[PDB]
Automatic annotation (TrEMBL), chain A:
Residues 74-263 form the SMODS-associated and fused to various effectors domain. The lineage of its organism: Bacteria, Pseudomonadati, Myxococcota, Polyangia, Haliangiales. This is CHAT domain-containing protein. The chain holds residues 21 to 299 of 521 of the full protein. It comes from Haliangium ochraceum (strain DSM 14365 / JCM 11303 / SMP-2).
């Protein structure tokens, strides 16, 4: 029982569910949905240019999810979800938060070399650097937490300082960075590959990090999440966040070497 | 030729030079110097509480070294240094850093059982730190920031405490962790500690020097050091010897108290921690004023020279518009400012604050204002560096505030003929451009004299064993 959500918003290289199906297992029931069927108009390279378009995409994702659960009916606790499409990382992160951690989430993305990576977020050390939380004390500074999750780029904290300055929140509560170094002997440079074997383990590590965050920073009042890498990571990080504990949550967009604000739940 | 530098810094059972003397070899000339009579207040168990006491101890050590050099003269070539006393470990580490690797030093210290260890750090004419971690690895990180170093003979390295202290200080960065715990030999009665005797003194000193010289190759793009000495004072002196401040830079020696570390001694002494805090206190109309003191224009000048988004990021300017006695006491007891800039009138006995519910002047005398400042300077970690009394005839109060506040700027009689507005606008502009207080004050008063009809010297700077910080090195904003 599968319900594919194809997040097609790129004008350049769009994919339809027809590219998703040959890598999916056998389906007793299959549901097709695209985001373009719900009023979210397309944008270049999967990223919007205005706050209005980001809000339209947010409400369109909400409408997609409402239609998906209404069409699936009562077996929505039996549906193994699948994620694909080519849009920005904040959109995948927002959908991953909206589904929550209980649902079965699998993400299909296409690599740089034609291999199609299918990766589950649950079962049927990846993050070598875990810093900002591996101390023992409890911070007393109010503000908002900036979380850097990436697989290709080490943390440049000055960008986080400048982005926090840009949005009026003059004080960040703390910086947490989770990054995977590539294994020795791998020829991928600074990038750590994300196969299907190492998916649920990294999902579990992200889960263990994200509700241990208020243990380390109980004084804080929100989360900024900065994501660099594949969209599987974006949906993975979205699945990790619990909005009732951590809210509000921000996902900014990286354009032109600078960070621009993209999605804020609630709006 | 010997120079006993005894560090008597403990209110309880202490050590004088007469106690040290029988354990050291005979010599022709002996210079005995105590840290106590160089302006150092003693503390419980040799561990200072307030940050001002640590700074006073630093300056006392520097003055004691200077006087030792002055007493020895040209005989500083053939001088053997002997260190003793009952002080905290960071003080010994700082003395060892100021003496450097090119000085014949030797620590003497009484054990638990009354045996007097004599530990020379140099060879006269196996691995002590057998467990070394962070260097033998090929973990040559290029990450920026500080480097934590754990040197101990008793307690094994705890990464949580080091990162806890570093995040508490706010420096959100460690390039790595280095530990040099010295495991005891097999079957010795000491248990979990290793005895540091004069037999394995120089070998331990050499191992420490090799470690601290191989740090910058391992962590190339690092910034400073964070040294956590845990053992006898001889080890602290050796560790201080091994560090070269020119290679590394900012070196910190946290103090252990109550199961955690506290900021105790840093060599390039950051006399303001974090952003400086400036308090503006306004008052006018003392019922007989020269017609109107435009406090609004003065605040326009101070805010146009004291507001850009980046230097409002670099400093907090809290004002107290039309303040009272209670308002200023609350501001001094909550904001904890470093710069007090009062704007208002005043007589020979000074400040006329805006009064209570009767809107007017509550004439507050100079001794009451000085007592207010002194009372606000009783909380922990509190030093006010600059009090600017932009008022009338406030020369004696600015003279008498020098023993509470390091540098003060007062006025003679210019009762606002618009020949003093040039001062406040350019003075703070010179501060926020990275200049010292002395140069800024001189430049501003030269601008005020040129705008005058005569030699108007309308403002006067009143500066002040362990002397306070002088106006020539008092700088607030980093360039």
């Amino acid at each position: 029982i599968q319900c594919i959500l194809v997040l097609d918003l790129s004008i350049d290289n769009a994919i339809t569910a027809c590219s998703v199906t040959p890598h999916l297992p056998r389906a007793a029931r299959r549901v097709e949905l695209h985001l373009n069927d719900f009023g979210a108009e397309r944008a270049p390279y999967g990223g919007a240019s205005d706050r209005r378009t980001w809000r339209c995409w947010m409400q369109a994702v909400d409408a997609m999810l409402a239609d998906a659960r209404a069409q699936l009916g009562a077996e929505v606790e039996f549906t193994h979800y699948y994620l694909a499409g080519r849009a920005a990382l904040p959109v995948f992160a927002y959908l991953g938060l909206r589904l929550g951690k209980q649902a079965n989430i699998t993400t299909v993305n296409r690599r740089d070399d034609g291999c199609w990576d299918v990766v589950p977020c649950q079962r049927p050390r990846f993050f070598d650097e875990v810093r900002g939380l591996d101390t023992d004390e409890r911070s007393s500074e109010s503000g908002m937490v900036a979380v850097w999750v990436s697989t290709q780029r080490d943390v440049d904290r000055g960008l986080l300082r400048a982005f926090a300055r840009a949005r009026g929140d003059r004080d960040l509560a703390g910086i947490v960075s989770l990054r995977a170094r590539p294994a020795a002997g791998d020829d991928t440079g600074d990038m750590r590959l994300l196969e299907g074997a190492d998916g649920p383990d990294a999902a579990r590590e992200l889960v263990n990090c994200f509700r241990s965050i208020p243990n380390q920073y109980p004084r804080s009042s929100g989360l900024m999440v900065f994501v660099s890498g594949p969209v599987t990571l974006a949906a993975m990080v979205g699945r990790a966040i619990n909005p009732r504990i951590h809210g509000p949550v921000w996902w900014p967009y990286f354009r032109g070497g600078e960070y621009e604000p993209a999605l804020e739940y609630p709006w």
